[PDB]
């Protein structure tokens, strides 16, 4: 522990705290009640990452062998980290940039990296909401637009790439995205996805026009919608035909997969993404409470709703994957029934699923020549329960195909999509606080303009930057970017926050601050994880990133409706200028911490 020369006379001094809180009734905002603070915090951490990144990662990492690492890493990094953020913001009375600059003026890179990773994550995260709004506008009609193929110029048959693929794939790839065959060629601005973008940003600027006290009632109405629509969706999913078969696929572990490095990196980067750690929004939200506030009750209540939800969503998601894998298996197996009774002319009430293997041997013993030209499809479950459930391929290709087979199918589309919208809007409330607040402590705007001018300003900029995701190649830009700026940037900052509190500030000084606020010292469970355990697990997951960055090939999926063996996946390699993009998106952030440190130490010299 460095003695940190001049730590006092920079922070409040543990008896000024009762005095400074009675004079901040007009400078800094407040919460209305305790329930407005809890619904803002657990609405920032849920949604769009329980549906999009979790089941996409869960199939690859052992089918259902992703729930072990996840849970353990959660309870071992998640808890400790989330608890360290609620307590360092409540005492230091500042945002994200004001906390880490009062714990040595060299660690100002953590406030500038938490601002740059909140701008780049929320750049593409508000594009997924504009795709959700496009699917909500396309409801309110009983023949749903993704339920049938269009016809040719000559009205005789369907379009050639709607006949080979699904009609749900000819609404996402060709009628929504209008996707191209590579990332190296981009088309035009695609005006109908521009309007939606505008819509999204406009709706985001209406609720956060003044920071807190507008985000309040919003959080109210949006922390209920999401929670009650999921429950209405649970008793529908378990009543389906093929359910309780994708649930068993979620819970049969593949224990060989638990000994790979890449299944602990994706589990470790999901905890720092599900919990909104290393963003700086949960420090600014906890900096508005009173000093005598139990910040330990709040950190273990929010964490057991965040852990319970990520399993509660995953058994709703996998109850409709098992329903598509029974609709497809009963249609592939009905193909083998109908192709046998048409080549040998049998009645229909004799060949069924109980004796298909009995009677196909009877057909080659009767006519060995007429049986040779027949074809028999080879299909069985665990081949339909393991498919391409890639990014933006579950809410748009898996759910929207299953909704069109329920009765009252326009009703289950609206509900579902509004639910997704809510889940994704309430997480952009706190993500706007990670950009507005440290840009307001930097003194770059003249401090007589209102708060509603800076906010609007930011919005415009981000909307004008969101034009790169509306091109023809705009889905290939969102994947790459997504993954990279969502994996690297989290881990580094998360580790810098745990180190600088217990080894630069001081964990023994920090225990005097907890005893003043909540009434007692932290337990022995909080002492081992802060000093020994969790700094280490993080320091580890950080070496697993370079083990799997090397010894892998950068590939991405390509649609290409001229490629032979069309509807299966085709993976080609990235161009050589993608390292410049990757570099920027996952460098700027990290090079920022050491960057500023160096800068200041130099100013020293």
């Amino acid at each position: 522990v460095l003695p940190n020369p001049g730590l006092d006379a920079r922070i409040p001094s543990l008896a000024e705290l009762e005095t400074i809180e009675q004079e901040e009734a007009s400078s800094r905002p407040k919460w209305d009640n305790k329930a407005q603070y809890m619904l803002t915090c657990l609405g920032f951490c849920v949604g769009l990452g329980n549906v999009w990144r979790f089941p996409y990662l869960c199939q690859s990492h052992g089918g259902g062998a992703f729930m072990i690492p996840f849970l353990i890493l959660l309870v071992l990094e998640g808890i400790p980290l989330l608890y360290l953020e609620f307590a360092i913001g409540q005492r230091l009375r500042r945002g994200s940039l004001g906390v880490w600059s009062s714990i040595h003026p060299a660690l100002k890179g953590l406030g500038l990296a938490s601002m740059l990773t909140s701008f780049m994550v929320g750049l593409y995260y508000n594009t997924i909401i504009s795709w959700i709004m496009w699917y909500l506008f396309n409801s309110f009609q009983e023949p749903l637009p993704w339920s049938d193929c269009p016809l040719n110029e000559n009205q005789t048959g369907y379009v050639d790439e709607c006949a080979r693929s699904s009609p749900v794939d000819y609404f996402w790839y060709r009628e929504t995205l209008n996707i191209s065959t590579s990332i190296s060629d981009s088309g035009s601005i695609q005006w109908w996805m521009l309007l939606c973008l505008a819509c999204a940003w406009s709706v985001l600027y209406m609720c956060t026009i003044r920071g807190i006290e507008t985000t309040g009632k919003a959080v109210y109405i949006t922390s209920t919608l999401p929670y009650v629509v999921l429950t209405i969706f649970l008793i529908r999913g378990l009543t389906l035909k093929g359910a309780t078969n994708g649930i068993v696929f979620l819970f049969t572990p593949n224990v060989t997969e638990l000994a790979q490095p890449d299944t602990w990196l994706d589990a470790g980067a999901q905890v720092f993404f599900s919990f909104s750690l290393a963003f700086g929004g949960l420090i600014s939200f906890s900096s508005y409470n009173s000093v005598h506030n139990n910040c330990e009750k709040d950190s273990v209540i929010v964490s057991i709703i965040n852990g319970f939800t990520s399993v509660y969503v995953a058994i709703v998601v996998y109850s409709v994957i098992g329903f598509r894998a029974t609709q497809r298996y009963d249609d592939c197996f009905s193909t083998n029934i109908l192709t046998l009774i048409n080549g040998f002319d049998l009645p229909e009430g004799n060949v069924t699923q109980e004796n298909f293997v009995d009677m196909q041997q009877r057909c080659n013993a009767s006519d060995p020549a007429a049986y040779a030209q027949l074809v028999f499809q080879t299909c069985d479950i665990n081949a339909f329960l393991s498919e391409a459930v890639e990014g933006t391929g579950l809410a748009f290709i898996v759910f929207t195909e299953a909704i069109t087979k329920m009765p009252l199918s326009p009703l289950w589309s609206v509900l579902f999509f509004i639910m997704l919208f809510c889940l994704g809007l309430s997480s952009m409330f706190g993500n706007m606080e990670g950009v507005v607040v440290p840009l307001q402590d930097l003194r770059v705007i003249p401090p007589k303009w209102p708060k509603e001018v800076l906010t609007g300003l930011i919005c415009l900029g981000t909307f004008l930057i969101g034009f790169i995701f509306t091109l023809n190649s705009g889905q290939y830009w969102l994947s790459l970017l997504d993954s990279y700026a969502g994996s690297i940037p989290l881990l580094i900052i998360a580790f810098c926050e745990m180190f600088s509190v217990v080894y630069v500030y001081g964990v023994d000084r920090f225990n005097k601050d907890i005893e003043f606020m909540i009434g007692h010292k932290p337990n022995i469970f909080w002492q081992v994880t802060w000093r020994v355990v969790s700094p280490l697990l993080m320091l580890i997951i950080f070496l697993f990133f370079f083990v799997v960055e090397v010894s892998q090939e950068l590939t991405y999926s390509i649609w290409d409706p001229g490629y032979e063996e069309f509807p299966k996946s085709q993976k080609i390699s990235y161009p050589n200028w993608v390292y410049v993009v990757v570099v920027i998106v996952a460098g700027v952030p990290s090079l920022t911490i050491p960057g500023y440190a160096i800068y200041k130490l130099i100013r020293n010299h």
Partner: peptide, 30 residues
């Protein structure tokens, strides 16, 4: 007419008038 342009026109209409209430309230409030 494309039912998606009507629902967009109602939703973008109730948003763009909701910002000119929340801007004039702020002013007629400070």
């Amino acid at each position: 007419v494309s039912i998606w342009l009507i629902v967009f026109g109602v939703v973008m209409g109730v948003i763009v008038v909701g910002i000119v209430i929340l801007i004039f309230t702020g002013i007629r409030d400070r």
